[PDB]
Amino acid sequence: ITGTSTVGVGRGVLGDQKNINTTYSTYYYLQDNTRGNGIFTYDAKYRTTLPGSLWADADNQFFASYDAPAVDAHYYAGVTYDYYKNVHNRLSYDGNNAAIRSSVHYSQGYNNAFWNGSQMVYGDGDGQTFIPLSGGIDVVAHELTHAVTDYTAGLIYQNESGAINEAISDIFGTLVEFYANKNPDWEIGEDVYTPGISGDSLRSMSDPAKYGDPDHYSKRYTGTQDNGGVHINSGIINKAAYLISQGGTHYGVSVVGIGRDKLGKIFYRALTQYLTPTSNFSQLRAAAVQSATDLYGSTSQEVASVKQAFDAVGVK
Numbered sequence: 001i002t003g004t005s006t007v008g009v010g011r012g013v014l015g016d017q018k019n020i021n022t023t024y025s026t027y028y029y030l031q032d033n034t035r036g037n038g039i040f041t042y043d044a045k046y047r048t049t050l051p052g053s054l055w056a057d058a059d060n061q062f063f064a065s066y067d068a069p070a071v072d073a074h075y076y077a078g079v080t081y082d083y084y085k086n087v088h089n090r091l092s093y094d095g096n097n098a099a100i101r102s103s104v105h106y107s108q109g110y111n112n113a114f115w116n117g118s119q120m121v122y123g124d125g126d127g128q129t130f131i132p133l134s135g136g137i138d139v140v141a142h143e144l145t146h147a148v149t150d151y152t153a154g155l156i157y158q159n160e161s162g163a164i165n166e167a168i169s170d171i172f173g174t175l176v177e178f179y180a181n182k183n184p185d186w187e188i189g190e191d192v193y194t195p196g197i198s199g200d201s202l203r204s205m206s207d208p209a210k211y212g213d214p215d216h217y218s219k220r221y222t223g224t225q226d227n228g229g230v231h232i233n234s235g236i237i238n239k240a241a242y243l244i245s246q247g248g249t250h251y252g253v254s255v256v257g258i259g260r261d262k263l264g265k266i267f268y269r270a271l272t273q274y275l276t277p278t279s280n281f282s283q284l285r286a287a288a289v290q291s292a293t294d295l296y297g298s299t300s301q302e303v304a305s306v307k308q309a310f311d312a313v314g315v316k
């Protein structure tokens with residue numbers, strides 16, 4: 001819609017207060033005009049027809065219980081856009097400042113979020129397994145990163161390609177969560193998962209086996225469920241990226257970390273220059289060694305830690 005750019009205030013899913021970019025034309029809309037061609041948050045109104053209706057508000061104040069998931073989807077979309085712009089010089093997910101669209105209140109008691117090929121969508125949860133899923137920044141950045149992957153490497157959402165697709169989204173969702181600060185960790189979804197049960201999360205990168213996910217190639221899932229285990233075998237790659245950033249010993253192999261920023265530089269170069277729709281873990285190993293050599297040199301420390309971490313998770 002067209003109007004004047006303004007700034008509202010609202011409260012997020014976890015009860016914090018934040019400023020959001022809005023647009024005024026009779027109503028205030030959840031339309032951030034400051035970032036590329038815009039950030040648009042919609043109300044799905046407990047249905048599954050998408051996108052629904054652009055979020056309109058009467059007074060530019062977003063403190064209603066109904067408003068909190070919209071506040072966070074709008075806000076964390078903006079933070080993720082700022083991450084990709086300021087750290088990797090990507091203008092939105094296509095590199096050309098595409099519009100970012102999100103719907104909230106999708107369905108009833110819907111315990112997931114996803115990228116549907118065109119927009120993000122967030123359920124409210126059922127209040128015991130999940131609270132509204134946009135409340136977690138690593139969730140929002142994870143889902144947005146599927147769009148980045150679709151537009152670059154194009155990783156097929158199945159078998160090893162899909163575990164890589166999944167692991168990339170976890171990696172950058174965490175890197176965004178660190179970038180914004182606010183209690184960063186190597187866990188996925190701890191902020192919106194199982195209200196009333198502290199300490200847990202959907203997935204762990206530091207130790208994926210805490211939730212039964214493989215942390216080594218020998219332990220890979222080889223069957224039918226979850227599109228060939230794309231949410232399960234991602235633990236193998238998630239552990240490698242953890243080892244690369246923070247270092248550690250894992251199945252006897254010791255790895256020295258090179259920090260968050262360098263994990264980012266190297267994996268972004270892998271995704272946008274070297275990965276193909278059908279890459280598997282071994283090509284992911286080679287792709288990541290090349291970026292390290294590209295950015296740091298044939299005999300860098302960086303090429304060394306990459307090789308080690310993949311040795312540590314058993315990827316040849």
Ligand SMILES: [Ca+2]
Nearest residue numbers: 057059061062
């Ligand atoms: Ca209001």
Ligand SMILES: [Ca+2]
Nearest residue numbers: 183184185190
């Ligand atoms: Ca956290």
Ligand SMILES: [Ca+2]
Nearest residue numbers: 138187188189
């Ligand atoms: Ca996290």
Ligand SMILES: [Ca+2]
Nearest residue numbers: 193194195197
């Ligand atoms: Ca919990």
Ligand SMILES: [Cl-]
Nearest residue numbers: 064065066067
């Ligand atoms: Cl309502």
Ligand SMILES: [Cl-]
Nearest residue numbers: 113114115146
């Ligand atoms: Cl998905």
Ligand SMILES: [Cl-]
Nearest residue numbers: 113114115143
């Ligand atoms: Cl997903």
Ligand code: NA
Nearest residue numbers: 017018019020
């Ligand atoms: Na703020």
Ligand code: NA
Nearest residue numbers: 019021034078
């Ligand atoms: Na801002």
Ligand code: NA
Nearest residue numbers: 224225226227
């Ligand atoms: Na299934």
Ligand code: NA
Nearest residue numbers: 186206246247
């Ligand atoms: Na640590």
Ligand code: NA
Nearest residue numbers: 293297298299
């Ligand atoms: Na060389």
Ligand SMILES: [Zn+2]
Nearest residue numbers: 142146166169
């Ligand atoms: Zn995903």
